[PDB]
Design a protein around this motif. Structure first.
Motif, mmCIF file in Angstrom:
data_model
loop_
_atom_site.group_PDB
_atom_site.id
_atom_site.type_symbol
_atom_site.label_atom_id
_atom_site.label_comp_id
_atom_site.label_asym_id
_atom_site.label_seq_id
_atom_site.Cartn_x
_atom_site.Cartn_y
_atom_site.Cartn_z
ATOM 1 N N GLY A 148 0.859 -1.208 0.000
ATOM 2 C CA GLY A 148 0.000 0.000 0.000
ATOM 3 C C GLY A 148 0.911 1.280 0.000
ATOM 4 O O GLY A 148 1.485 1.742 -0.905
ATOM 5 N N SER A 149 0.970 1.811 1.244
ATOM 6 C CA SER A 149 1.823 3.032 1.435
ATOM 7 C C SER A 149 2.789 2.844 2.543
ATOM 8 O O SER A 149 3.553 3.711 2.974
ATOM 9 C CB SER A 149 0.849 4.283 1.576
ATOM 10 O OG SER A 149 0.176 4.153 2.788
ATOM 11 N N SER A 176 11.001 -6.319 -8.105
ATOM 12 C CA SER A 176 9.646 -6.311 -7.529
ATOM 13 C C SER A 176 9.421 -6.655 -6.108
ATOM 14 O O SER A 176 8.635 -6.220 -5.300
ATOM 15 C CB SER A 176 8.650 -7.062 -8.472
ATOM 16 O OG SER A 176 9.079 -8.477 -8.418
ATOM 17 N N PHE A 177 10.317 -7.587 -5.607
ATOM 18 C CA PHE A 177 10.374 -8.095 -4.297
ATOM 19 C C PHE A 177 11.062 -7.152 -3.233
ATOM 20 O O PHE A 177 10.918 -7.375 -2.087
ATOM 21 C CB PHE A 177 11.115 -9.491 -4.268
ATOM 22 C CG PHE A 177 12.545 -9.523 -4.805
ATOM 23 C CD1 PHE A 177 13.539 -9.042 -3.901
ATOM 24 C CD2 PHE A 177 12.834 -10.059 -5.982
ATOM 25 C CE1 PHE A 177 14.893 -9.035 -4.334
ATOM 26 C CE2 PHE A 177 14.192 -10.083 -6.456
ATOM 27 C CZ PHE A 177 15.138 -9.514 -5.596
ATOM 28 N N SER A 178 11.842 -6.229 -3.763
ATOM 29 C CA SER A 178 12.635 -5.320 -2.900
ATOM 30 C C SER A 178 11.696 -4.540 -1.981
ATOM 31 O O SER A 178 10.790 -3.957 -2.518
ATOM 32 C CB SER A 178 13.581 -4.529 -3.726
ATOM 33 O OG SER A 178 14.506 -3.777 -2.966
ATOM 34 N N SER A 179 11.964 -4.715 -0.688
ATOM 35 C CA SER A 179 11.238 -4.004 0.362
ATOM 36 C C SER A 179 11.573 -2.454 0.126
ATOM 37 O O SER A 179 12.467 -1.984 -0.509
ATOM 38 C CB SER A 179 11.706 -4.441 1.732
ATOM 39 O OG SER A 179 10.971 -5.553 2.162
ATOM 40 N N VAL A 180 10.473 -1.796 0.577
ATOM 41 C CA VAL A 180 10.345 -0.338 0.314
ATOM 42 C C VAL A 180 10.088 0.345 1.718
ATOM 43 O O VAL A 180 9.526 -0.181 2.649
ATOM 44 C CB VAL A 180 9.244 -0.081 -0.683
ATOM 45 C CG1 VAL A 180 9.431 -0.857 -2.052
ATOM 46 C CG2 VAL A 180 7.781 -0.436 -0.280
ATOM 47 N N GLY A 181 10.256 1.641 1.602
ATOM 48 C CA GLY A 181 9.977 2.457 2.865
ATOM 49 C C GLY A 181 11.041 3.429 2.994
ATOM 50 O O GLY A 181 12.125 3.551 2.373
ATOM 51 N N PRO A 182 10.706 4.442 3.911
ATOM 52 C CA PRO A 182 11.682 5.513 4.196
ATOM 53 C C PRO A 182 12.999 5.113 4.765
ATOM 54 O O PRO A 182 13.995 5.827 4.619
ATOM 55 C CB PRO A 182 10.814 6.551 4.997
ATOM 56 C CG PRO A 182 9.870 5.628 5.711
ATOM 57 C CD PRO A 182 9.509 4.468 4.756
ATOM 58 N N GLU A 183 13.028 3.957 5.386
ATOM 59 C CA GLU A 183 14.284 3.358 5.957
ATOM 60 C C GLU A 183 15.203 2.753 4.917
ATOM 61 O O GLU A 183 16.464 2.486 5.221
ATOM 62 C CB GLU A 183 14.055 2.355 7.074
ATOM 63 C CG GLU A 183 12.910 2.491 8.045
ATOM 64 C CD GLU A 183 11.480 2.300 7.684
ATOM 65 O OE1 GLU A 183 10.568 2.400 8.514
ATOM 66 O OE2 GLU A 183 11.150 1.986 6.478
ATOM 67 N N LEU A 184 14.802 2.628 3.673
ATOM 68 C CA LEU A 184 15.649 2.165 2.595
ATOM 69 C C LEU A 184 16.781 3.143 2.294
ATOM 70 O O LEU A 184 16.541 4.350 2.194
ATOM 71 C CB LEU A 184 14.800 1.836 1.325
ATOM 72 C CG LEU A 184 15.424 1.365 0.030
ATOM 73 C CD1 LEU A 184 16.033 -0.098 0.281
ATOM 74 C CD2 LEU A 184 14.138 1.032 -0.885
ATOM 75 N N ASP A 185 18.002 2.629 2.399
ATOM 76 C CA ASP A 185 19.152 3.504 2.177
ATOM 77 C C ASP A 185 19.769 3.619 0.887
ATOM 78 O O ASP A 185 19.954 4.690 0.196
ATOM 79 C CB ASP A 185 20.308 3.330 3.286
ATOM 80 C CG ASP A 185 19.833 3.592 4.705
ATOM 81 O OD1 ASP A 185 19.835 2.703 5.526
ATOM 82 O OD2 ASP A 185 19.303 4.735 4.866
ATOM 83 N N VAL A 186 20.110 2.353 0.356
ATOM 84 C CA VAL A 186 20.838 2.223 -0.870
ATOM 85 C C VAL A 186 20.271 0.946 -1.597
ATOM 86 O O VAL A 186 19.707 0.060 -0.933
ATOM 87 C CB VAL A 186 22.376 2.223 -0.697
ATOM 88 C CG1 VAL A 186 22.984 3.550 -0.069
ATOM 89 C CG2 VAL A 186 22.874 1.025 0.156
#
Length: 263
Positions: A148-149, A176-186
């Motif tokens: 979602g978001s 497609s599988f790569s986790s997302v979110g503001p905590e993603l760095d590189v």
């Protein structure tokens, strides 16, 4: 060697004589098959109660991650920190035991190609302490994809002190599988990554678990050029010299460029 090494710009450092020598890298994983002729293991330890030898990889995951580290930083001192059993599962206590060991044993770089859906105060403490203790702490962002978001970055990747690495393919596209979110760095290459498997074999695996060690490897290379750099410095150099991809929620800072990060 592998496409993912060239994609992060590692061979430019190799060619200059920067190959991560004297850099202690902790692969906190399923162990590493020390018998692999392509592998050189310096040490380690097991924290899996029933699998006492860290040099025996009953899963393949640890060997494969190890291989990616060495592929990026061929001269790095690899340590098998065995926290996952043959099934690739591990209890949090073994995982934290292994980070505790990594700090005590003066590991420069911690690679965690492992993630759980929940944190613990003990998990954040151990990660925090390693960072506080000058260790570069690298973890996979997770293989959760989009939700979602909401943030799908797992732990330890979700903690600010940890570099959370997402996966891109060879086209610089987010997997497609790569986790997302503001905590993603590189981002690092994480699809069809060719590496060492136990029993003198090679094979490809996909996952942010695969993208993580390219960053751990990249951290080792940077440290081999600038041994005086703090973990904070290596961190900022890797995040600030990225090839910018899409939105940070999906790509972090973008793709690591070790040649740019190493100055």
């Amino acid at each position: 060697g592998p496409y993912g090494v060239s994609q992060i710009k590692a061979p430019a450092l190799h060619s200059q004589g920067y190959t991560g020598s004297n850099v202690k890298v902790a692969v906190i994983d399923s162990g590493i098959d020390s018998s692999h002729p392509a592998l050189k293991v310096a040490g380690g330890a097991s924290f899996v109660p029933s699998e006492t030898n860290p040099f025996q990889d009953n899963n393949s995951h640890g060997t494969h991650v190890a291989g990616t580290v060495l592929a990026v930083a061929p001269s790095a001192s690899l340590y098998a920190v065995k926290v996952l059993g043959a099934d690739g599962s591990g209890q949090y206590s073994w995982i934290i035991n292994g980070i505790e060991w990594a700090i005590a044993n003066n590991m420069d770089v911690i690679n965690m190609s492992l993630g759980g859906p929940s944190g613990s105060a003990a998990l954040k403490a151990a990660v925090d302490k390693a960072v506080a203790s000058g260790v570069v702490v690298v973890a996979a962002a997770g293989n959760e994809g989009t939700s979602g978001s909401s943030s799908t970055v797992g732990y330890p990747g979700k903690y600010p002190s940890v570099i959370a690495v997402g996966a891109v393919d060879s086209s610089n596209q987010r997997a497609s599988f790569s986790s997302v979110g503001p905590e993603l760095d590189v981002m690092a290459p994480g699809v069809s990554i060719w590496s060492t498997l136990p029993g003198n074999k090679y094979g490809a695996k996909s996952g942010t678990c695969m993208a993580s060690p390219h960053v751990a490897g990249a951290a080792a290379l940077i440290l081999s050029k600038h041994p005086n750099w703090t973990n904070t410095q290596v961190r900022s150099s890797l995040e600030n010299t990225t090839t910018k991809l899409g939105d940070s929620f999906y790509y972090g800072k973008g793709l690591i460029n070790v040649e740019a990060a190493a100055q």
